[PDB]
Design a protein around this ligand. Sequence first.
Ligand code: HEM
Length: 153
Amino acid sequence: VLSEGEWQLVLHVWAKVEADVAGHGQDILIRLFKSHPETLEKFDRFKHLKTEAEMKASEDLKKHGVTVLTALGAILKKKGHHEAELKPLAQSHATKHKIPIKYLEFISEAIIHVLHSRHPGDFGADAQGAMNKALELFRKDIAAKYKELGYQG
Ligand code: HEM
């Protein structure tokens, strides 16, 4: 479980992400798609996008970025009491979208890269540590629902 202090480090930097949800969402998805191109192939909506410049220009991608970060934010702010929010997400991602747990690890790494670029002063090693723990908790709870439903390990 995270401590109350580790949750404070997480939510202090998240309040900053919330000053520019759309800009953050874009940087994260682009980083994901460039670092792990197989992830782009899950999105019928985006797989036409070939270059970073085309990605940066897509308003539809920006929109999805806001969807992703807004769902994540609502989970983080529950501080691990996140059952009601996480269950519908794991169900759709397991059964409808077919998203391997490994890809959740990839987008975790993208989130932490981007936070580090935009918010150095609020994202030191102790914050990076807390954020890593929070994302692991997110993954571990998703993985439990995946196993229940019979989805890939
Ligand atoms: C922090 C991780 C993520 C969060 C919070 C998240 C959240 C969401 C939300 C809220 C939606 C819309 C409602 C629904 O379908 O459940 C969605 C849709 C989707 N997500 Fe995720 N997602 C995450 C990770 C991923 C990753 C890693 C991928 C793919 C590699 C993925 C692929 C998709 C696809 C294919 C859709 C449908 C988009 C569309 O075609 O409209 N998601 N996600």
